[PDB]
């Protein structure tokens, strides 16, 4: 037999350039019959649940899906609490749900008379409703009325579940600032394509963005700069708690991170007493990495960190909290080691668990509890992670989103080389690391270039897209000329939903 991989495509990207669904990620299975169903104006939503109080979230889900549906086909669309759905209704249901999908899966079945979509937990409602979306004309994801497309869905039967199930996204809000429409927007279009982790990296060298009322310099000193220089920003602990809650209706768990002890310049430059001499650092608005270090013998830094945790703790929902790790280039192995056992010891007491990168796993203060975020990959990272028991999440070269697509993109980094749309699509977890427990995948989405929402657009669309198939989709079921060809069709719901993305020449 005769293989080839893929070059670019003659004359230029399809996505420039281009009764027909556009599922993606890939769901485990998709079969059309003959016939479809019509969504009119008199649909209802139906929502049925185990117990009133199932009944209750589904309400609420059906709810965010009337919406979704009604800015586009301009129907007003209305949720009922009933098991006795009418022809030409939605129906949402746990009831029945088939168990070995999990609580993410879910069949959704459309008929002539009724789209049915059956779970086992509203999660899966929720996931399911992204591709009941996808099933639909583009144009449905308009955020204004579109006029002359009949909205119908070909009678289909799917069945669905992740491979993995961490699927995430991180946003650093650090080297430059977004603001929490920007924030929420890329939570809700993550969301689209089923990722259901949203890890916000809050504080690095050049600013920190998270009030901490017990250390109010972090704010009026520390939040005031960014990359390049201007003005930068933070959020209020009230703001952090609308993002929260805001990816909470999406069952997206939000991972704050406060990186540590390296990468924390903005923390050195707002309080002197963390600084051997006692001085403020000046501010840092370049891009180095790695030369910056808590001190790791001085009880003010565990006090510091203490502080910072318990506030956060306070506020932030999820289990996990992220202290970061990397490039700890100013603090020896020893210090490292013990410090970063000793933050985790002070997490756990605030009952949270820990994530950090590599090489954090290999703190002896470390338990089977933490998890490893693995972006080196390398054929001796995690082996202390795999020992230990520990989850990992890995974010590899083909998930760093923020490299450039090709020498020539006019944002970027490209110190992982170049990732492009099939770079971002041709990889599997275990290529990552061997022989662990692999919890699943970030992207990460670091911004020393990026500076605009439509910055953000180009890189994570369509990369993110790749990667989200990469989360969700066997390793078995996923093919780049597949995926390829998928994204082509996909592309004018990229345009209707009005995202900036770049129109990838391989594809
Ligand atoms: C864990 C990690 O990635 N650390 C740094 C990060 O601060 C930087 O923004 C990114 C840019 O790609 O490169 C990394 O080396």
Redesign the pocket.
Known sequence: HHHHSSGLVPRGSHMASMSQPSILPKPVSYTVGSGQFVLTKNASIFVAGNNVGETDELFNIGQALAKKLNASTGYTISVVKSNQPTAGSIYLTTVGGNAALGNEGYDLITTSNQVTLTANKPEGVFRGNQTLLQLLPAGIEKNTVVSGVQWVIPHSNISDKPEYEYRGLML?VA?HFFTVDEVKRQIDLASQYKINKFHMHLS?DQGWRIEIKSWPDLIEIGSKGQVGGGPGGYYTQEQFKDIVSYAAERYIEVIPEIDMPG?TNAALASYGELNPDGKRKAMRTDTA?GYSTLMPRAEITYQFVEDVISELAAISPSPYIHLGG??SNATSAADYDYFFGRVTAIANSYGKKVVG?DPSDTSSGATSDSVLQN?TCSASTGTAAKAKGMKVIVSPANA?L?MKYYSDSPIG?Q??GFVNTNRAYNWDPTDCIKGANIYGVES?L?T?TFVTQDHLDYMLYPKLLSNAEVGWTARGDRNWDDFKERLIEHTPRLQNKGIKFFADPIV
């Open positions: 650093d080297r690095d990468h990495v990397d490039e990168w972006w760093y923020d980094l110190w992982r990460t670091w020393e």
